[PDB]
């Protein structure tokens, strides 16, 4: 390096840093991923139960 | 699944019945004709030990 014009100086390299990032939920494998071909998806559910049976 | 639906109306219907019998009734829903009391049946009475949180 040159500090001005007449003058040298000594030079210590860089200093670099990094904003954290967190991976909790990446790490529980807690999704699962299906790959489409259209933007519309479709979903069925289904209920069942049980009854009363009255004296007869 | 109509033979499912039966099975676990049935199976309901036992565990009812099951818990009935401890608070002393029988359990016919719907029928006078076998709606016992066993307290009144036997010619005994109920005893409450009541406990108290509070203190």
Do not use: C
Not at chain 2, 14 to 32: F, I, R, V
Not at chain 2, 37 to 45: C, F, P
């Amino acid at each position: 390096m040159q500090n001005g014009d007449f003058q040298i100086l000594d030079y210590t390299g860089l200093i670099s840093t990094m904003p954290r990032v967190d991976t909790l939920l990446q790490s529980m494998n807690l999704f699962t991923e299906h790959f489409g071909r259209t933007t519309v998806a479709r979903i069925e559910r289904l209920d069942d139960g049980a009854g009363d049976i009255k004296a007869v | 699944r109509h033979m499912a639906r039966i099975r676990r109306s049935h199976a309901i219907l036992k565990s009812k019945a099951m818990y009935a019998a401890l608070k002393g009734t029988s359990w016919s829903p719907d029928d006078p004709v076998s709606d016992y009391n066993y307290y009144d049946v036997w010619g005994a009475t109920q005893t409450t030990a009541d406990v108290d949180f509070t203190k």
